[PDB]
Design an enzyme around this catalytic site. Structure first.
Site, mmCIF file in Angstrom:
data_model
loop_
_atom_site.group_PDB
_atom_site.id
_atom_site.type_symbol
_atom_site.label_atom_id
_atom_site.label_comp_id
_atom_site.label_asym_id
_atom_site.label_seq_id
_atom_site.Cartn_x
_atom_site.Cartn_y
_atom_site.Cartn_z
ATOM 1 N N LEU A 45 78.111 27.272 40.568
ATOM 2 C CA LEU A 45 78.399 25.780 41.219
ATOM 3 C C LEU A 45 79.678 25.233 41.172
ATOM 4 C CD1 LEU A 45 74.838 23.992 40.480
ATOM 5 C CD2 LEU A 45 75.607 26.005 42.062
ATOM 6 N N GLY A 46 80.700 25.840 40.121
ATOM 7 C CA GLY A 46 82.371 25.357 40.496
ATOM 8 C C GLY A 46 82.139 25.643 38.929
ATOM 9 N N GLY A 47 83.895 25.154 38.529
ATOM 10 C CA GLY A 47 84.037 24.778 37.475
ATOM 11 C C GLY A 47 85.913 25.342 37.440
ATOM 12 N N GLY A 48 86.271 24.460 36.263
ATOM 13 C CA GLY A 48 87.924 24.197 36.813
ATOM 14 C C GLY A 48 88.648 25.523 36.578
ATOM 15 N N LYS B 26 76.585 23.775 32.784
ATOM 16 C CA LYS B 26 77.931 22.918 32.573
ATOM 17 C C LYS B 26 78.234 24.054 31.128
ATOM 18 C CE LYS B 26 81.958 20.606 31.979
ATOM 19 N NZ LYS B 26 82.071 19.335 32.827
ATOM 20 N N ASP C 178 88.586 9.856 34.812
ATOM 21 C CA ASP C 178 89.165 10.747 35.358
ATOM 22 C C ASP C 178 87.626 9.947 36.828
ATOM 23 O OD1 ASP C 178 89.666 13.370 36.549
ATOM 24 O OD2 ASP C 178 88.478 13.995 35.039
HETATM 25 N N1 LIG Z 1 75.096 18.802 37.634
HETATM 26 C C1 LIG Z 1 75.538 19.333 38.899
HETATM 27 N N2 LIG Z 1 74.848 19.676 39.971
HETATM 28 C C2 LIG Z 1 75.592 20.196 40.713
HETATM 29 N N3 LIG Z 1 77.071 20.539 41.162
HETATM 30 C C3 LIG Z 1 77.335 20.279 40.341
HETATM 31 C C4 LIG Z 1 77.576 19.636 38.936
HETATM 32 N N4 LIG Z 1 77.851 19.220 37.732
HETATM 33 C C5 LIG Z 1 78.767 20.221 38.497
HETATM 34 N N5 LIG Z 1 78.404 20.532 39.578
HETATM 35 C C6 LIG Z 1 79.699 21.286 40.854
HETATM 36 O O1 LIG Z 1 80.597 21.999 39.632
HETATM 37 C C7 LIG Z 1 82.042 21.037 39.291
HETATM 38 C C8 LIG Z 1 81.892 21.073 38.389
HETATM 39 O O2 LIG Z 1 83.686 20.493 37.370
HETATM 40 P P1 LIG Z 1 83.734 19.326 36.560
HETATM 41 O O3 LIG Z 1 82.124 19.554 35.633
HETATM 42 O O4 LIG Z 1 83.509 18.320 37.529
HETATM 43 O O5 LIG Z 1 84.555 19.816 35.642
HETATM 44 P P2 LIG Z 1 85.478 20.871 34.720
HETATM 45 O O6 LIG Z 1 85.233 21.911 36.140
HETATM 46 O O7 LIG Z 1 84.394 21.773 34.676
HETATM 47 N N6 LIG Z 1 86.619 20.614 34.484
HETATM 48 P P3 LIG Z 1 87.939 20.057 35.495
HETATM 49 O O8 LIG Z 1 88.857 20.836 36.180
HETATM 50 O O9 LIG Z 1 88.466 18.689 35.049
HETATM 51 O O10 LIG Z 1 87.198 19.342 36.550
HETATM 52 C C9 LIG Z 1 82.228 20.218 39.742
HETATM 53 O O11 LIG Z 1 83.305 19.538 40.652
HETATM 54 C C10 LIG Z 1 81.169 20.755 41.150
HETATM 55 O O12 LIG Z 1 80.902 21.107 42.004
HETATM 56 MG MG LIG Z 2 85.506 17.220 37.416
#
Ligand SMILES: Nc1ncnc2c1ncn2[C@@H]1O[C@H](COP(=O)(O)OP(=O)(O)NP(=O)(O)O)[C@@H](O)[C@H]1O
Ligand SMILES: [Mg+2]
Ligand SMILES: Nc1ncnc2c1ncn2[C@@H]1O[C@H](COP(=O)(O)OP(=O)(O)NP(=O)(O)O)[C@@H](O)[C@H]1O
Ligand SMILES: [Mg+2]
Ligand SMILES: [Mg+2]
Lengths: 289, 291
Positions: free
Chosen positions: B20-23, B43, B134
């Protein structure tokens, strides 16, 4: 970084006899010592964290050669301890002194302020910040000279300035005050000017303002909106020049607080009549009556 | 870290589905509870040995002690093969950034509803003496019901761990300048930084970009510090009401001394509007699956 090349890899006690504990806080002791061959007196400071970052204090002191900064002799690394060898200031710190003599005269405070300011102007021109200006860190030697000491916290400043700009987050969404901290840090050298103002009150009243209040409460107060800068308790004992000195050094806004160099032009520290004899008098009073 | 963290493979409890993502420092997965069938988000975070664990403790703990609808819900954590897995509420629409990069800019009413929900989340956090630090579109998650969840307390954790660590060794404060004292207690700012970020986020939601996104990051940092940097504004004046223009103007107050708090902003005209509900975001999601 590895330990500086000029540091001695031997036990300081091979060169010096330890005579008396001069103090030191919770974590490190300062000794009055005597050179086993020369007979000359020195002060040895025995200073988790990191060897290469703790030695920053040595580098700062070593690169300072100014009449208002305590003179550096050398340093030792032996077993589990870093030692700074420096000039022995016979009367110790101003706090040591006033705890015996009582409050200083205004002329005497004025003289200390001028000498501290000269030390600070020197330090700031080298982009150093003392960060720990106070009575306990201003030493007086037998020649009546005023010397800045204790660069432990200053070492934390210098270490950050040698390193590149590192970030926590992304700037576009940062508040301007978050941006400022991330870039320049939350403060600069003008913080020493404020501390000197508090020190002057300390020398005048034997305590910094709000000393009887819980530290955390004081910290929370200083961060509140509308914090009132401290003042001298008794308005009548002191000249208008002194009240004004306190007022401008204790300028709340870091952008409007005057530099060390500007402060050196203030009427209080440019008085004709300021001379080392003022300090020799204090030392006499310390000695006997 | 957490005293109730599961030192076991998450795949014992969950089947992993999509990414679903990840920085840059990990990934996020949609997962299914093998017992209940319920869907979660996993995560994953890499634990490298020169990374002092205090940060990762802080993140989980911040997430663990938040009970508010507008904060992504915490279920548990796994430590397995030096990987930290954080199990949380699944938000099927992903982040607002994920969405607007397809749907295009949000309507004023849609932004107003998001701001209200975030301000509800931010009001709670600041009442816990917590700072998100943030707030941005990528960190505002949307579930399938159109509801809004603040997430990613990674930065909060970092700054938090640093401060608790430095606090112990900050000595007596009586000789400290106020600016030094401010740094000691809290890195030299307050929770009112979140309100600024929300203001920027509203503009981001309106224009697909934060202000000055075309300017190099380090330069923006520089320009913002300089005395006389003027707060951003919405590009087009005529696409938005006066209430929105004012919301931006009032949240983007330079002085952290005169910038309104969360709770004060909840009474603002823009977010106190009747007619604000998750239906507005459901509309956005509808737009996402057709035209
Ligand atoms: N609980 C969740 N349900 C669905 N999608 C999620 C969820 N948590 C995160 N995501 C997706 O996956 C991404 C995760 O990135 P996030 O947790 O905000 O920070 P990060 O990537 O771990 N570190 P950063 O680069 O600072 O954003 C989010 O932007 C969403 O697109
Ligand atoms: Mg983020
Ligand atoms: N060169 C010196 N000559 C004479 N007395 C000294 C000297 N250096 C330090 N002292 C005394 O010993 C104390 C040592 O303090 P300092 O040099 O600040 O080390 P420290 O480990 O940082 N102690 P602290 O005040 O808690 O930070 C001073 O306050 C003086 O009383
Ligand atoms: Mg000291
Ligand atoms: Mg010290």
């Amino acid at each position: 970084d590895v330990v500086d090349p000029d540091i001695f890899n031997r036990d300081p006690r091979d060169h010096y006899d330890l005579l008396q504990r001069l103090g030191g806080g919770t974590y490190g002791e300062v000794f009055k010592a005597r050179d086993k061959v020369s007979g000359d007196l020195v002060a040895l400071k025995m200073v988790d964290d990191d060897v290469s970052t703790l030695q920053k204090e040595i580098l700062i002191l070593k690169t300072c050669r100014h009449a208002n900064i305590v003179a550096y002799h050398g340093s030792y690394l032996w077993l589990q301890k870093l030692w700074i060898c420096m000039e022995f200031c016979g009367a110790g710190s101003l706090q040591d002194i006033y705890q015996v003599t009582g409050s200083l005269s205004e002329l005497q405070i004025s003289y200390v302020c001028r000498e501290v300011l000269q030390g600070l102007a020197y330090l700031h021109s080298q982009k150093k910040i003392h960060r720990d200006i106070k009575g306990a860190n201003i030493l007086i030697n037998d020649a009546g000279e005023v010397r800045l000491a204790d660069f432990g916290i200053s070492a934390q400043i210098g270490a950050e300035l040698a390193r590149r700009l590192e970030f926590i987050g992304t700037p576009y969404w940062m508040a301007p005050e978050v941006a400022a901290v991330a870039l320049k840090g939350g403060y600069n050298e003008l913080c020493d000017i404020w501390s000197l103002g508090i020190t002057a009150i300390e020398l005048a009243e034997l305590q910094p303002p709000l000393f009887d209040v819980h530290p955390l409460r004081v910290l929370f107060l200083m961060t509140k909106s509308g914090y009132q800068p401290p003042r001298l308790k008794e308005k009548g004992k002191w000249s208008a020049a002194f009240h004004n000195f306190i007022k401008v050094t204790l300028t709340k806004s870091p952008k409007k607080r005057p530099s060390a160099t500007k402060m050196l032009s203030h009427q209080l520290v440019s008085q004709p009549g300021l001379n080392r004899g003022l300090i020799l008098d204090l030392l006499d009073k310390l000695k006997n009556g």
